[PDB]
Every structure is written in structure tokens, then in C-alpha cells.
Amino acid sequence: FIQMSVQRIVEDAPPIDLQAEAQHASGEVEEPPRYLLKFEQIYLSKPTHWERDGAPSPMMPNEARLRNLTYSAPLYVDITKTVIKEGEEQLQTQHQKT
Amino acid sequence: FGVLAKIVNYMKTRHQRGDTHPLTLDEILDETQHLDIGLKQKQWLMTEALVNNPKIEVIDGKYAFKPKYNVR
Amino acid sequence: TVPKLYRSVIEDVINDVRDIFLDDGVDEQVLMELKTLWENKLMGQVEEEPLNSEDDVSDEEGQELFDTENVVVCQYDKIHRSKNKWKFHLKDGIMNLNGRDYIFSKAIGDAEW
Amino acid sequence: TNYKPVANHQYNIEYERKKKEDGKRARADKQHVLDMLFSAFEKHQYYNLKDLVDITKQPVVYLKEILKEIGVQNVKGIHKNTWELKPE
Amino acid sequence: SGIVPQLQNIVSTVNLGCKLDLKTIALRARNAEYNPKRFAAVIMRIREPRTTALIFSSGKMVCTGAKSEEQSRLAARKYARVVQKLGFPAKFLDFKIQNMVGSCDVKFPIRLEGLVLTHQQFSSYEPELFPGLIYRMIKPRIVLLIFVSGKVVLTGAKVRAEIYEAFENIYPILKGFRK
Amino acid sequence: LSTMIGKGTGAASFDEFGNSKYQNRRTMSSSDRAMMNAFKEITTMADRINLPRNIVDRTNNLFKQVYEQKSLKGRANDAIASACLYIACRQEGVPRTFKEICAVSRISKKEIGRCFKLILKALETSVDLITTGDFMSRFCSNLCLPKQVQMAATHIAR
Amino acid sequence: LDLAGPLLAFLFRGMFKNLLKEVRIYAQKFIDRGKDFNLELAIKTRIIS
Amino acid sequence: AQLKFFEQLDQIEKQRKDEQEREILMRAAQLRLKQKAKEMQQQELAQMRQRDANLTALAA
Amino acid sequence: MAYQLYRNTTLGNSLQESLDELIQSQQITPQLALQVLLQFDKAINAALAQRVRNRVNFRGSLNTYRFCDNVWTFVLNDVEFREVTELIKVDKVKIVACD
Numbered sequence: 031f032i033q034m035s036v037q038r039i040v041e042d043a044p045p046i047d048l049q050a051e052a053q054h055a056s057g058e059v060e061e062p063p064r065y066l067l068k069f070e071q072i073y074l075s076k077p078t079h080w081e082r083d084g085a086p087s088p089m090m091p092n093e094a095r096l097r098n099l100t101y102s103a104p105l106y107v108d109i110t111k112t113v114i115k116e117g118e119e120q121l122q123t124q125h126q127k128t
Numbered sequence: 129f130g131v132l133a134k135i136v137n138y139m140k141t142r143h144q145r146g147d148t149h150p151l152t153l154d155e156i157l158d159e160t161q162h163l164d165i166g167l168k169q170k171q172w173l174m175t176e177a178l179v180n181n182p183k184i185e186v187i188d189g190k191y192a193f194k195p196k197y198n199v200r
Numbered sequence: 201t202v203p204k205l206y207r208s209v210i211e212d213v214i215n216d217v218r219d220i221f222l223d224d225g226v227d228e229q230v231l232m233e234l235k236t237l238w239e240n241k242l243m244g245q246v247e248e249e250p251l252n253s254e255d256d257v258s259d260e261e262g263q264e265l266f267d268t269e270n271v272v273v274c275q276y277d278k279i280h281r282s283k284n285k286w287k288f289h290l291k292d293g294i295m296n297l298n299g300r301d302y303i304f305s306k307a308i309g310d311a312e313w
Numbered sequence: 314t315n316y317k318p319v320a321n322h323q324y325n326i327e328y329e330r331k332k333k334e335d336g337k338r339a340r341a342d343k344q345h346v347l348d349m350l351f352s353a354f355e356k357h358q359y360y361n362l363k364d365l366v367d368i369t370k371q372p373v374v375y376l377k378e379i380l381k382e383i384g385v386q387n388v389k390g391i392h393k394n395t396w397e398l399k400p401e
Numbered sequence: 402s403g404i405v406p407q408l409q410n411i412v413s414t415v416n417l418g419c420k421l422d423l424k425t426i427a428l429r430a431r432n433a434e435y436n437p438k439r440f441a442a443v444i445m446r447i448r449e450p451r452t453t454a455l456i457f458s459s460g461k462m463v464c465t466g467a468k469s470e471e472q473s474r475l476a477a478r479k480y481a482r483v484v485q486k487l488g489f490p491a492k493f494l495d496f497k498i499q500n501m502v503g504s505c506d507v508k509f510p511i512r513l514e515g516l517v518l519t520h521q522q523f524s525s526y527e528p529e530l531f532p533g534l535i536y537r538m539i540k541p542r543i544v545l546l547i548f549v550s551g552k553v554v555l556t557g558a559k560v561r562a563e564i565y566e567a568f569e570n571i572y573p574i575l576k577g578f579r580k
Numbered sequence: 581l582s583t584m585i586g587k588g589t590g591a592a593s594f595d596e597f598g599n600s601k602y603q604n605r606r607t608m609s610s611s612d613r614a615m616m617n618a619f620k621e622i623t624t625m626a627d628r629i630n631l632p633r634n635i636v637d638r639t640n641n642l643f644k645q646v647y648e649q650k651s652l653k654g655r656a657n658d659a660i661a662s663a664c665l666y667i668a669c670r671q672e673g674v675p676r677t678f679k680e681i682c683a684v685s686r687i688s689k690k691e692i693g694r695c696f697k698l699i700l701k702a703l704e705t706s707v708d709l710i711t712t713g714d715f716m717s718r719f720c721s722n723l724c725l726p727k728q729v730q731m732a733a734t735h736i737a738r
Numbered sequence: 739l740d741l742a743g744p745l746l747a748f749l750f751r752g753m754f755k756n757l758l759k760e761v762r763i764y765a766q767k768f769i770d771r772g773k774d775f776n777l778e779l780a781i782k783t784r785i786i787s
Numbered sequence: 788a789q790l791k792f793f794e795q796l797d798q799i800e801k802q803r804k805d806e807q808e809r810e811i812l813m814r815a816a817q818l819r820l821k822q823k824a825k826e827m828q829q830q831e832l833a834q835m836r837q838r839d840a841n842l843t844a845l846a847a
Numbered sequence: 848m849a850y851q852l853y854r855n856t857t858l859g860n861s862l863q864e865s866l867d868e869l870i871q872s873q874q875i876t877p878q879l880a881l882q883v884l885l886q887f888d889k890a891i892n893a894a895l896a897q898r899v900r901n902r903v904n905f906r907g908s909l910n911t912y913r914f915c916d917n918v919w920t921f922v923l924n925d926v927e928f929r930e931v932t933e934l935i936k937v938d939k940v941k942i943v944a945c946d
Contacts (some may be wrong), residue, residue, distance in 0.1 A: 031743035050769050080630035083674045085721035131349025136400050184401040212890040220882045237865040247494045251482040269939045273852050276944035292895045304903035311909035320680035321688040324774035336438035345838050352831040427915035434914035521706045529678045530693040728758050835848040846918040
């Protein structure tokens with residue numbers, strides 16, 4: 031599951047395509063920008079518990095049993111965002127380990 | 129055509145004056161700061177189209193008596 | 201330099217007015233005559249309502265009436281002022297200083313009030 | 314690195330800069346606004362108030378007052394009750 | 402205490418009693434500016450009193466920048482006279498000082514932490530938002546900006562007596578927290 | 581004091597063109613819907629920085645008090661929620677910087693601070709002044725510094 | 739026999755689809771306004787967990 | 788003047804040919820109608836653009 | 848119906864005087880003269896925007912300023928127009944700006 035299925039589920043999902051609804055009522059020759067998001071390269075951290083202070087710390091299983099915590103691990107995905115504003119330039123910013 | 133609706137508003141204020149008299153288009157166009165050229169002719173084609181639906185009454189002869197109910 | 205820019209402007213102006221001269225039906229000789237003439241011409245008060253208690257609280261207004269001194273006409277992109285000083289990002293424009301004309305693209309100015 | 318502390322989000326500062334540069338729409342004189350409205354109506358017969366505000370570039374209250382002076386709202390099967398720029 | 406605050410800015414509002422044409426005023430006045438897209442009033446400045454006034458079409462004017470009450474009244478009268486010279490029936494009606502700002506120094510560093518601890522009901526110290534402590538005095542409705550360097554700025558006063566009284570009230574308190 | 585209806589079975593539930601549940605259920609009032617949306621936003625913001633549920637509940641109570649008090653009715657909801665979250669963190673003894681709250685809220689730092697002042701005035705309460713030791717644990721852990729380094733930094737700042 | 743892996747894969751399929759749906763909605767609002775939405779804010783972390 | 792009337796009739800033939808010689812190009816991929824529509828759109832801009840001229844002359 | 852800035856300069860004044868002479872001679876109609884002025888304004892704006900690539904500087908003191916309809920009317924005194932190639936001194940200047 032973790033090694034293959036999670037990554038394959040992330041990759042199988044179609045890229046998100048978004049555009050404005052003829053904003054500004056101008057000539058509107060594809061003027062509304064197109065935003066494209068593609069998820070990639072899922073990362074999992076070791077099980078971690080964040081305290082009331084907000085300081086991350088490893089979560090041992092027995093501590094989870096005693097304090098009624100849930101044994102879970104953070105899940106991170108790289109996301110690539112492309113902006114197409116029909117300005118003849120497309121910018122593909124990348125967000126790492128979201 | 130928009131200037132035409134503006135002329136309609138002008139004659140509406142003319143009714144508001146109460147001095148409504150049989151008029152024509154040239155004097156209104158002059159007093160509203162507009163000229164008399166073939167533009168007046170195309171806008172007069174539009175104006176006759178208006179005379180086909182002039183709920184604000186614009187007749188050709190002695191005219192402009194808009195209000196369907198009008199006594200004073 | 202500036203005269204050469206002026207000649208280029210002449211060419212642009214004549215080219216730009218040719219189409220209007222065709223649209224209005226006027227003969228083209230008008231443009232030639234215009235260029236010839238243009239070149240030749242160039243080369244305890246409790247009751248405080250009365251404000252008359254103060255006088256000579258203004259300055260001479262004839263400067264703006266005269267306008268004979270040097271004049272700069274341009275376009276402004278940014279104009280900032282911080283409590284004493286006026287700052288000027290004036291873009292491309294023209295200047296008339298001592299009759300001689302100056303041409304510029306970026307103009308930066310600092311003045312005091 | 315996620316959710317790093319930022320004083321203000323980048324998109325918000327860009328939007329605020331654009332809005333500040335544009336400024337608020339100014340209340341122009343009645344004559345010019347009326348002339349622009351009449352030309353707009355000349356384009357074709359029916360206008361919605363939102364796009365009419367965009368066309369006129371006037372405050373919504375002032376434009377609504379001027380439009381109530383001459384134009385009239387008609388309830389219609391297009392989508393909804395909209396303004397009519399014909400004075401009658 | 403031996404220290405008296407000195408006024409740095411005074412805000413006064415006066416009604417001219419007549420409607421005005423902002424565009425005409427902008428075109429004809431000397432130092433006036435009018436940007437209806439930016440602000441709905443006309444901003445004018447006079448150097449001799451060293452003040453700035455905002456003039457509205459309703460006939461009400463606000464004068465700021467004056468260091469003294471007399472300077473504020475004289476500047477407001479000068480602005481009204483300038484508008485009157487432009488042909489309008491400008492008058493001088495219900496002139497009033499809406500706000501006064503004063504500044505001073507206590508000449509010693511202050512422990513704002515102890516001050517906010519002692520007067521938490523009136524104090525507000527947030528270094529993230531603003532390094533100066535904000536004190537809201539009650540008996541005079543004055544807001545005081547107290548700084549670790551000792552500078553104190555008072556605002557919200559209608560009369561100079563309020564400024565002086567507020568400083569007189571705050572000085573022993575600050576003396577109690579001298580660093 | 582409400583209920584809601586589902587699809588049920590497949591027969592007369594859907595009618596001429598799929599009427600569904602005769603309707604859509606359409607429940608409640610704005611004085612509760614706005615508070616509900618604010619609670620959802622608060623939970624989202626807290627989970628963004630892994631805040632504990634007790635701080636979330638304190639934020640919810642603070643927002644309820646502010647919203648019913650109504651001195652901040654003119655301020656946009658999200659700003660009130662963010663300022664309430666900041667105040668709850670301060671009261672619980674684990675303060676987050678205004679920038680840290682802005683990182684997880686769409687509201688800018690300036691608006692968050694203004695709403696924070698207004699909420700303090702409306703509640704007639706106060707928050708203890710932050711100290712350098714409050715942020716040492718989180719800052720050092722996020723920097724992955726050793727415990728001795730964290731102790732040294734805390735001692736140096738104090 | 740469906741063990742732990744396939745069952746959790748089914749659930750994660752559903753929840754990741756929901757997460758992308760929420761990102762779509764949240765970003766569409768801001769795009770209509772013309773603001774350049776932040777991806778980190780769009781992601782609702784609570785959904786999957 | 789009679790010759791100028793004949794030239795105007797020739798310009799009318801030239802506009803008909805241009806409008807119809809391609810009311811056909813559009814079909815192969817109403818030209819006059821499109822031109823009229825384009826002319827209608829400018830009117831609003833022209834005046835919004837134009838009265839600024841009147842105030843700028845007053846300003847300067 | 849344009850920006851209409853350079854009309855009140857040497858170039859615009861010469862063009863206007865020439866148009867006045869032709870109008871006196873009946874060679875051109877006033878509508879044609881106005882059209883010529885409009886076309887000149889367009890051409891001059893484009894020419895200054897495109898063919899000018901020099902950066903200038905100036906300093907001084909300000910005595911008056913005005914703003915209306917996006918039109919600045921600054922009035923400076925004792926201005927020093929400094930350029931890398933030359934320096935010019937002027938006792939008074941009026942800067943009219945638009946956008």
C-alpha cells in the first residue's frame with residue numbers, strides 16, 4: 031500500500047485544470063488564465079507527534095498506547111503549478127513536500 | 129442611436145417645462161449641441177423606426193404629446 | 201540631433217495625414233504647402249465671519265498667466281512626496297528651455313517646498 | 314518548510330497593488346455618463362447592471378440613480394429582472 | 402514634574418457653510434491637488450503656517466499640521482479666504498479642534514514590561530505589531546505611546562489642558578518603572 | 581431541533597425527472613451557519629500547524645463570545661477566527677507569532693493584529709506578554725537543533 | 739481475500755479524489771476573483787487523515 | 788462635379804465587390820455586417836476617449 | 848480627441864500657425880486642420896515614445912504645484928537640469944505632466 035499504491039493513486043488522478051469564467055468582460059481571447067496542478071513524488075515521514083508547543087518529536091508506539099494518541103505518519107506530495115495567462119509565457123512553479 | 133434616446137430624454141424634460149410646442153429635429157439637435165449632416169439622416173432613419181414604436185409620442189407633423197393621459 | 205528627430209517627425213506626420221487627406225477628398229498638394237509653410241515658420245474677533253481681517257496672504261498669480269518662461273511637457277509614471285520634498289519619475293517628454301528644445305526618456309527630479 | 318511564516322501572502326499583495334493602482338471609480342458628470350450610457354444602449358437593447366457598471370466606470374450608487382432617472386427595470390424571462398436603457 | 406509636552410500636530414474642522422466645486426478649486430488654487438479616484442476631497446498646503454487642509458464639496462474643511470491652536474485657526478482662516486478669493490461664499494463657522502498631538506521625553510529608559518504588568522487594564526504592549534506601548538488613560542481620554550527610549554507621544558486630546566494633565570498623570574507611573 | 585432525509589429506496593422516491601428527496605433539506609439560520617463555517621476554518625488553520633484540539637476548543641469559545649458580542653461584525657469572519665486562534669495560543673501558554681498565524685490564514689498580519697486588539701477590547705481580557713523562551717522549543721525543533729543547543733539559546737536570550 | 743493494503747487503497751482513492759475536489763473548488767473561487775491562490779492553503783489536510 | 792459623381796458610383800461598386808468578394812472568404816472558412824458591428828463598438832470608446840480631450844484643454 | 852500635450856510648444860505652435868495661414872487662404876477647411884492636429888499628436892507621441900533613448904536628471908526647488916484630471920502643473924525655481932553629457936541652469940520652470 032504505502033510504497034506503491036499511494037504513489038500510483040496520486041499519479042492516476044487527472045491533473046487539475048482551472049480557468050476564470052470570462053473575467054473582466056474584455057475581448058476575452060482566452061484572456062482568463064489557465065491554472066494546471068499536477069501532483070507527484072509522494073513522501074512519507076516517520077511517525078511523529080507534535081506537542082502543544084508545536085515542536086515535532088518522534089512518537090514511540092507505547093507512548094501512543096498510553097496517551098491515547100494515534101500512530102500516524104505525515105504524508106507529503108510535490109505539486110507543480112503552471113500558470114498560462116496567454117501572455118506568451120508560462121511559468122511552472124514547483125511546491126516541494128506539501 | 130444612443131444620441132436618439134438622449135433626444136427623447138430632452139423632449140421629456142421639454143414636457144417637464146410645460147411649454148411643449150410643435151417642433152422638429154433640427155432645432156433640438158442644435159440646442160443639444162449636435163450637427164446636421166448625413167449622420168442626422170441615418171439617425172433620422174432610426175428616428176422613423178422610433179416613430180413606428182414611439183410610446184413617447186414622436187409624430188411627424190404637430191406632435192410630441194407623449195402622455196396617454198394629459199390634462200392640467 | 202534634435203533637428204534630425206524633427207525631420208523624422210515630419211515624415212511620420214505626413215505619412216499619418218495622407219490617409220485623412222484621402223478620406224476627406226482633398227487634393228494632396230495641401231500637404232506639400234503645409235510642410236513648406238511649417239518649415240518656413242519654424243526656421244478678540246468674536247464675530248469671525250469677516251475674512252478681511254487678513255490681507256496680502258497670497259502671491260502674484262501672473263506667473264501662470266505669463267507662461268513665457270521655460271516650459272516642460274511630459275508624462276509622469278510615479279510622483280512621491282514625503283513631508284518636505286517632491287520626487288519625480290517623469291517619463292518620455294519634451295522640454296523648452298531658453299528656446300532650445302531638449303528630448304529625454306527618463307527624467308528624475310527632486311524639489312523642496 | 315511548509316506553511317512558513319509570511320507577513321502577507323504574495324497573491325494578496327499583488328491583488329492589493331493592482332487595486333490601489335487602479336483606484337476607486339470616480340463620479341463623473343451627469344452629461345458624460347448619460348452620453349456613454351446612450352452609446353452603450355446603441356450597441357444593442359438589453360444590459361445587465363454589472364456589465365453596465367463595467368462599461369460606464371462609475372460608482373454603483375450614482376449610476377443607479379442616473380439609470381433610475383431615465384431607464385426602467387423590466388422583469389423578463391431572459392434570466393431575471395434587468396434594467397432597460399430605453400427611457401420609455 | 403518639570404516637563405511639559407510640546408504639540409506636534411493639531412487637527413481642526415471648520416464648516417464654510419456653502420457647497421463648492423472641487424474641480425474649479427483644483428484648477429484655480431495655487432497648491433491644491435484633486436484626485437477623485439484616490440480621495441474625494443481637495444488637498445491644499447500653505448507653507449507659512451506649514452499646514453495641510455482637506456476641502457470637501459459639502460463645505461466642510463479639515464486643517465492638520467498646525468503646531469499651535471492659534472496657528473490652526475489662522476491656517477483655517479487662510480484656507481477659507483483662499484476659497485473665498487476663488488469666488489465662493491466661504492465663511493468661518495463652528496471652527497473646532499478635533500484632535501491634538503503632543504510629544505515629550507522623560508529622559509530615562511522605561512521598562513514597558515513592568516508597566517504593562519502593573520497597568521494591564523490600560524496598557525497594550527505588542528512588540529510584533531508595534532514596539533511602543535499603548536496606554537489608554539481614562540480620566541483624560543488620551544492615548545499615550547510610550548517607548549523604551551523614554552519618548553512619550555500623546556494623542557486624542559481636544560485641548561492642551563488634556564495633554565498636560567495626561568502627562569502629569571503618566572509621569573509618576575513612568576517614574577515608578579525607571580530603568 | 582432538526583432532521584434530514586435521504587434517498588431511501590428505489591421506487592417513488594425519484595419522480596417525473598428524478599425529484600430526489602422531494603427537495604433539498606435546507607436547514608438553518610445565519611447566526612449559526614456563519615459560526616459553523618468559522619469553526620471549520622479554525623480547525624483547518626489549526627491542523628495546518630498541528631495545533632492540539634484543546635487550543636481549537638478555546639479558539640471556538642473565544643469566537644463564540646466575540647461573534648455574539650458583535651463589536652467586530654464589520655470585520656471579515658476569517659480575520660476574527662485567526663485573531664481568536666492567536667489569542668487562544670497565547671492563553672494556553674504556547675504563543676505563535678502573528679506571521680505564523682498569517683502563514684496558515686488567508687488574512688494578512690495587519691488585519692489579524694487589528695482584530696486581535698478589537699477582540700481583546702471586546703472580551704475585556706488580557707494575554708500575558710510573550711517572552712523569548714516561549715518560541716525556543718518550536719524554533720529549535722524546526723531547525724533540528726540538539727537539546728543542548730536549544731538550552732543554550734534559551735539561556736542566552738533570557 | 740482483501741487484506742489491509744487493498745482496503746486502505748480503496749479508502750485513500752476516495753479521499754484523494756475528495757481532496758482534489760476541494761482544491762478545485764477553493765482555487766476556482768480565487769481564480770474568479772483574479773487572486774493567485776496559494777496551493778498550501780487550498781489543501782485541506784484533515785480530509786485524508 | 789458630374790465626373791466626381793461618377794467616381795462616387797465607382798467607389799460604391801468597389802465597396803460592394805470588396806464586401807461580397809469575401810462575404811465569400813468567410814463562408815469558405817456577412818463581412819459588411821461584421822464591419823458595421825465593429826463600427827458600432829467604437830462609438831462608446833470614442834466619446835469616453837473624446838470628452839477627456841475637452842477637460843484636458845480646460846486643464847491646460 | 849487625444850492626449851493633446853505638445854500643441855502648446857514650438858512645434859505645435861508652428862503647425863497651428865501654418866494651418867491658420869491655409870485657413871485664411873481657404874486652402875483647407877477647419878475640420879481638416881483639426882484632423883491634421885490630431886494626427887500630429889498621435890505621430891509625435893509615438894515618435895517620442897519610440898525614438899528617444901536618453902536618461903536625464905534635474906534638481907531644484909518647488910514654488911507651486913497643482914493637480915486636476917490627472918494633470919500636474921508643477922512650478923519650480925532655480926532648477927539645474929543635470930545630464931551626463933551636459934548641464935543646464937534655469938531660473939524658473941513649469942512642468943506640466945499627464946498620464
